[PDB]
Homo-oligomer: A and B are copies of this chain.
Amino acid sequence: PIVQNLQGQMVHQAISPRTLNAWVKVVEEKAFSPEVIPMFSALSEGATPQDLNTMLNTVGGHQAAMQMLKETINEEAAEWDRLHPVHAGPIAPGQMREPRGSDIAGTTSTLQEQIGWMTHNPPIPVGEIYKRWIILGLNKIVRMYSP
């Protein structure tokens, strides 16, 4: 995640193993139950896309759901690209590039790039955009997996 250091700057720090394991354990115990979404939300505080793929990729089991989510993440990403067209002409030397759906999904962007966008002024909340897609896709799952 990207956290504030004592000095008063935003720097990246790694997520903790008993945080990781707590994510694992939630999924083990409460599967598709709604409490998973606030839980997720708390444990995703200050998290990167990269950390969010890590969390999704580290799941075991419920592979039908994991595939449905993936496909929702790509749909929501396809929709990001649709709604926000690429911008006019070449990229400025003085500036950094606008993200695509795949940069938001973490796929085409690097960590330093993910830190550029979030730490820069104005900052862009690529975590929160992926977060809604995850929560939206979580609703899809919850609604389906209701019996």
Contacts and interface: CB of A to CB of B under 8 A. Distances in A.
A3 to B, nearest CB: 9
A1 to B, nearest CB: 10
Q: Looking at chain A, what size class is its interface with the partner chain?
A: 20 to 34
B35 A15 contact: no
Contacts of A93: none
A64 interface: no
A58 B33 contact: no
Contacts of A21: 22
Contact of A14 (B7, B38, B45, B59): B45
A43 interface: yes
Contacts of A30: 60
